[PDB]
Amino acid sequence: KGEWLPGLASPDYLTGSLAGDNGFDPLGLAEDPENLKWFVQAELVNGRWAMLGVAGMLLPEVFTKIGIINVPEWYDAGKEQYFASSSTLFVIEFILFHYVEIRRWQDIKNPGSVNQDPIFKQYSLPKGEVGYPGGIFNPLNFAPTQEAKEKELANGRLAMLAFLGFVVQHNVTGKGPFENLLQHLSDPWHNTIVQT
Amino acid sequence: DISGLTPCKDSKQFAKREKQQIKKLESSLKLYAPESAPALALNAQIEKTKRRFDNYGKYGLLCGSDGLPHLIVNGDQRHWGEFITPGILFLYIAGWIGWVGRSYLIAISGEKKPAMKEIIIDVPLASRIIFRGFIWPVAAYREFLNGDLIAK
Amino acid sequence: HWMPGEPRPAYLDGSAPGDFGFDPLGLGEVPANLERYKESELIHCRWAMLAVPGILVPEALGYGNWVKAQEWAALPGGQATYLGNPVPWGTLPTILAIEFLAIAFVEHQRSMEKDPEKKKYPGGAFDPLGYSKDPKKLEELKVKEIKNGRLALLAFVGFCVQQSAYPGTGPLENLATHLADPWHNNIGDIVIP
Amino acid sequence: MRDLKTYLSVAPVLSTLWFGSLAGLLIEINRLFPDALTFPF
Numbered sequence A: 001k002g003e004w005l006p007g008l009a010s011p012d013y014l015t016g017s018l019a020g021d022n023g024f025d026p027l028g029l030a031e032d033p034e035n036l037k038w039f040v041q042a043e044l045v046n047g048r049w050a051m052l053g054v055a056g057m058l059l060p061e062v063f064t065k066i067g068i069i070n071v072p073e074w075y076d077a078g079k080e081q082y083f084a085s086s087s088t089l090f091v092i093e094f095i096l097f098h099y100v101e102i103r104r105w106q107d108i109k110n111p112g113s114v115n116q117d118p119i120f121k122q123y124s125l126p127k128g129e130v131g132y133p134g135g136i137f138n139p140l141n142f143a144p145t146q147e148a149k150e151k152e153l154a155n156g157r158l159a160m161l162a163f164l165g166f167v168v169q170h171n172v173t174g175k176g177p178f179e180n181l182l183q184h185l186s187d188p189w190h191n192t193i194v195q196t
Numbered sequence B: 001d002i003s004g005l006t007p008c009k010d011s012k013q014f015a016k017r018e019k020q021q022i023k024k025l026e027s028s029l030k031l032y033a034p035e036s037a038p039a040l041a042l043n044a045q046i047e048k049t050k051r052r053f054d055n056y057g058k059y060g061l062l063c064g065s066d067g068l069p070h071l072i073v074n075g076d077q078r079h080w081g082e083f084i085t086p087g088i089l090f091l092y093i094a095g096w097i098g099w100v101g102r103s104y105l106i107a108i109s110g111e112k113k114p115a116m117k118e119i120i121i122d123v124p125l126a127s128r129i130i131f132r133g134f135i136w137p138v139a140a141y142r143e144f145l146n147g148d149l150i151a152k
Numbered sequence C: 001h002w003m004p005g006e007p008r009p010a011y012l013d014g015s016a017p018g019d020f021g022f023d024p025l026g027l028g029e030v031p032a033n034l035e036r037y038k039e040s041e042l043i044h045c046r047w048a049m050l051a052v053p054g055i056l057v058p059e060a061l062g063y064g065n066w067v068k069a070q071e072w073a074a075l076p077g078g079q080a081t082y083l084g085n086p087v088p089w090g091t092l093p094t095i096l097a098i099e100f101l102a103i104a105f106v107e108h109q110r111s112m113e114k115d116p117e118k119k120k121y122p123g124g125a126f127d128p129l130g131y132s133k134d135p136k137k138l139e140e141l142k143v144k145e146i147k148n149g150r151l152a153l154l155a156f157v158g159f160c161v162q163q164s165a166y167p168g169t170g171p172l173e174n175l176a177t178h179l180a181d182p183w184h185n186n187i188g189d190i191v192i193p
Numbered sequence D: 001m002r003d004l005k006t007y008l009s010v011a012p013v014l015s016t017l018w019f020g021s022l023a024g025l026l027i028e029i030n031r032l033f034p035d036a037l038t039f040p041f
């Protein structure tokens, strides 16, 4: 589709048949079709996790402007006490995610081989793409046209960049992400990465 | 106290070594006027020696019976900066260099006279290849998985 | 299948009892090695399926766990006990002599058989109640036997591993400890300190 | 000149330039951060 840099010719292996294809591959990671097949799924999963992470880091902090709830900032939520110890929660999360990710992994190797429920054999997911399961995972039956996939990928890339910014800003500033925006909005021409 | 060693900041021999070096440096200073340039150089050397000893004291090194720092390379988390991290950095840099060299060698293998491109470097091709080595681990791992790394 | 979406090895057709195509390392490619491995697996399953009843019943009756019963032999002159009653022949040199002689005869007798089918299911005098009359029931019986043996092997592995983490404690003591406060007495506090 | 650019791509000249830049960078790095024995970060 569009060009990430006008005046430069798109690589041949990027034929534009994929959603969100702008011909951006200066270092040639996706020359091998198997590598491209793996990296598409990797990007999809990374973005889908990153958007949720950013939503969970930003929104539970914007409460200060509204004063509705009281929750510690994203880097202090770990130290708080909970009804169960860290070890038990970590073990349960490991046990569940092992099964979930092993089930997801098998579809990349042999598509259409994990479409049937293992206990109740009369329940199955309708056939679809590798990274787009559908069925019960799409309860509202929104049509997955190419435009929506491009929107999803753009939002995922933006959220990856946002999470990287969130991580980097806290390391050097020592505060959360929302107050950094307010500090910049206070005096824009003096509060930047150049402190002076 | 691994293997009977002691911290640098608690070692008396370390302070004795620092005092001896400072005293040796200060002896030559008395031969020159305070405003003379050699006096400034000697003052800078003394300040650098003091700063080096203070920095060695701050980093939590271990001293032996002779007042000299010793390096632990067994993998203890308290001493991961002596061997582990610089080793990983060196491995990354060496892999970058090797991958760049291998890619350049492979690229020119199909030319009519490949031996001519080895003594007279094709600068644009090398420059286009140089930046590619920044992600060498991923490329190497995927090449190994696809069976391309080893010649048949 | 042991894992849906994974191809089966060519030598595991799924016709043998308790066959689910599990061989990631390919240890059974050789036809001669595979035949021996079935006998070894059956022997291990049969041996482990007798230890489990003998590892919980003595503990559940208050006679001590399974590792306390071996401590007396280290002491000099220790005498064995059974049901709280010492046995006259409980001396250490007498115990080993009967144990070695008794099992050195049965195992050597088992080794001498040459028909592969009898090395796993000999039949004959070891089946007095006649459960082998129906070939149709025999296959489901073999599947039941194979399925239970691996479970007992896993149970014995758990028994052995739990002892290392909690010395001097019995498996029933482990169950009682976990039952009281499930959300803090579990595997988690051991894996991470 | 094409022939002048060709002579700059010969192995000894390129090696000399690369190693000179490398040595300058290393000398400056050691000047900024002297007496380094452990990685503190």
Ligand SMILES: CC(/C=C/C=C(C)/C=C/[C@@]12O[C@]1(C)C[C@@H](O)CC2(C)C)=C\C=C\C=C(C)\C=C\C=C(C)\C=C\[C@@]12O[C@]1(C)C[C@@H](O)CC2(C)C
Residues within 6 Å of the ligand: A024, A025, A026, A027, A028, A029, A046, A047, A049, A050, A052, A053, A054, A056, A057, A074, A075, A077, A078, A160, A161, A163, A164, B135
């Ligand atoms: C998944 C992710 C973040 C996930 C976060 C999650 C789930 C949760 C976070 C939490 O906050 C919560 C919710 C609650 C808190 O209490 C705890 C934590 C745990 C803190 C980020 C991904 C982030 C992913 C990023 C940033 C990826 C960047 C990739 C780039 C830039 C690649 C560039 C190129 O590869 C191209 C495209 C083409 C090549 O040819 C050239 C180059 C240039 C190499």
